[PDB]
Amino acid sequence: VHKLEPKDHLKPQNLEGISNEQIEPHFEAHYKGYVAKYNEIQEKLADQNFADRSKANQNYSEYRELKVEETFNYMGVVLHELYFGMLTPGGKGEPSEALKKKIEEDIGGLDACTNELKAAAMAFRGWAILGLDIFSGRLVVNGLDAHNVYNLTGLIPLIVIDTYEHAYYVDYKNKRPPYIDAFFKNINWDVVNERFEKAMKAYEALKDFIK
Amino acid sequence: VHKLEPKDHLKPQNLEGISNEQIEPHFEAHYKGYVAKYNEIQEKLADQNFADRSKANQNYSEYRELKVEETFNYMGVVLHELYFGMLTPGGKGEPSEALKKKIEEDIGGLDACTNELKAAAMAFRGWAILGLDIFSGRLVVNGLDAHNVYNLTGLIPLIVIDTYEHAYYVDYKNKRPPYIDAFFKNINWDVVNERFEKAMKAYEALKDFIK
Amino acid sequence: VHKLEPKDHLKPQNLEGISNEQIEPHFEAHYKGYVAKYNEIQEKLADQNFADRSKANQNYSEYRELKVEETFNYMGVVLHELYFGMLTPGGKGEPSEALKKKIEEDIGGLDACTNELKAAAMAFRGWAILGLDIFSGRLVVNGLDAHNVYNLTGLIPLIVIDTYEHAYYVDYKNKRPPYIDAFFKNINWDVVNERFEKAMKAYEALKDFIK
Amino acid sequence: VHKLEPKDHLKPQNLEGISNEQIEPHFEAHYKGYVAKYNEIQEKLADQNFADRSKANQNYSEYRELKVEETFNYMGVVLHELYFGMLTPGGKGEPSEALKKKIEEDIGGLDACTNELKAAAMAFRGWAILGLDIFSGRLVVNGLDAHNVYNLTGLIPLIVIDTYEHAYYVDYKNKRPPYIDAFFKNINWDVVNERFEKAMKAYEALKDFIK
Ligand SMILES: [Fe+3]
Ligand SMILES: [Fe+3]
Ligand SMILES: [Fe+3]
Ligand SMILES: [Fe+3]
């Protein structure tokens, strides 16, 4: 089966506003837990007798349940890697001119975009994502209620904010706003800018996908 | 606001196993209904007073509800366009050698892939999708329980099967299997092959997205 | 295990506005399908080795998936039995004075209640229910997006309307409004009135549940 | 409109294994937040122009969104009141003989029931409930992934365990098992026994609900 292993090199440390105490369980327990479960699902999915494809049924079937949780755990892995990977103590770099221009024409400006992201982060129960919609070529804010609920198909993630309670409860308890501000203070723009460059290059090959 | 309009040129006709009687309400009522509602949401989202961003709240807020249904309706539009757009009476072309090779190494073969797709179509309440996962560069089968439930972020769709009851109830009533077979008989491989080419070119710019 | 068997005596026939052609697959395929799957889940849940309780995990575990679908299928059974059981050709009886009075004080009147029910039936993707909320002792309209999504705990169902597409697609295709009107024409008020009497008697023992 | 107010007298203090620091935000912020939002929804639902019933639509409509979140917030209120209301420092009383006998015949014994509850609490993302199913007259364990997801219609709650992360993150961080044990140490059996008595009396009026 196609198994995954955690990327320890992605673990943030000494962030401004987000303690190591908060990072520890988030990275070591939650993130790694999704990796472990995804692997279990892969093993069971590989067993044609356990996940019998001929018994596939929408009311209940081993195959169905495995596929349902596969999206939950895989997204749990991916989203966390995108989240931790873009955090550096005190932040780094700045959004590129190309990124600023796109945000300006699609969202209205950096000010409008930040407000939009904070709003989505406050309105959603799982994640708030700023990404490129490959179907329209526009930057969009996608809010998720869970790792696998409300995700837009095809979206290339640029900025990912975890709004699950475990992401901020150690430091801020019920107070989400100060956590969102802290997240913005530690954004590694070198990472985001690179993601954008790749996203745009990819979009050039994907334009007019639906004709 | 960014409004959409239906793509009438995508409407299939005289399909083998899928009647015009079945296609009519699916295209004219359902598909166009998602376009209309998406547009309404865009207008309301543009009104900063109605969708007050400062009032964003996860328990309930006008902003939240609009963003939630935005994903439902937008995916409803996109998925339907990908669905209708790949159907031609009696089918057309054949899967490219490049596509067959990728399926072979990622899924195990055309036989394994067809079985996998039919299984997902039988196991899921909304859609069954074969697409390219930009995070691993592998073809994967993604089942959805609704337009916006269980979608994998970043997935580039190649083959999309609608499993909503309105998609086959006119012709087959509760019988989904014969509908799935009929779908396979009308696949326009020229469309799918092109999608694959673009998907692979896009992946080349996206490889090593997470480092 | 605690198994169930379909209640064939509940099958409606010769309804006004709802054909036998529509009733057939709904009762014989869908309803009975939920009974069959619920039974399978019960058998697997009884096997302590398959549904290992010590391995219970929220990301994925055999125990979890079985419990998730148990609610889907059991509600599928119960809701359908309440639905079919209250339909008689051309309708029967009338709402009791006691029922009318409660509706009047809780909802505002029969006119307001009918409008409320039709609205919920049009707004929800699964079911529209008029029932007694045991926590407040008030009649409330509860809309569900699926058999097990948005259900209010403790609610005693009086009137249940199926809004799943399979419930009306044979007769009305995408047109839900005429189906809702037809449903109201075949309501067996003797059944509903009895449900109400029992619900109220039950509420008398349940009042002040939360102190 | 029918508004609600928090029940301050339900706030637990000096629990064994669950600190006041943990209780504070749970009761003062989360619980009271659901009460506030439910009230807002009631006001907006009362405005026939805002929540226009004639515009009821399942893709999106003000009426729909309000009804969706109404279940989220109302259940948030009710479930929390049942949760806090059954907690006393060090626990109190013991399960009645009547309760023990029912558990014995329906579940298999106190030992089996405790194991079942802990399993459901570990397998579900929102709540784990032991209640009386009015349709079968049997005690059942109902797991929920959220306040309004997977709830069984008609269920009369006896024991309610909150598994949301905010319920235990202050004291145990990611460690849910020790929290579940602590919950069992503070159960006020006088409350549970009374709930059971009322539930059984109610069931006597509800037996043979579906005929
Ligand atoms: Fe997280
Ligand atoms: Fe469709
Ligand atoms: Fe149905
Ligand atoms: Fe809680």
PDB file of C-alpha atoms and ligand atoms in Angstrom, chain B residues 26 30 34 80 83 127 147 162 164 166-167, ligand 2:
ATOM      1  CA  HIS B  26     -31.108  17.178 -14.819  1.00  0.00           C
ATOM      2  CA  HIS B  30     -30.957  20.979 -11.368  1.00  0.00           C
ATOM      3  CA  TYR B  34     -27.170  25.699  -8.995  1.00  0.00           C
ATOM      4  CA  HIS B  80     -22.249  19.039 -13.544  1.00  0.00           C
ATOM      5  CA  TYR B  83     -20.213  15.439 -16.093  1.00  0.00           C
ATOM      6  CA  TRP B 127     -20.455  11.570  -6.783  1.00  0.00           C
ATOM      7  CA  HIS B 147     -21.479  18.339  -3.985  1.00  0.00           C
ATOM      8  CA  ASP B 162     -23.150  11.784 -10.644  1.00  0.00           C
ATOM      9  CA  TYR B 164     -27.535  11.715  -6.984  1.00  0.00           C
ATOM     10  CA  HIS B 166     -32.066  12.674  -9.969  1.00  0.00           C
ATOM     11  CA  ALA B 167     -29.273  11.538 -12.297  1.00  0.00           C
TER      12      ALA B 167
HETATM   13 FE    FE E   2     -26.895  15.879 -10.659  1.00  0.00          FE
END
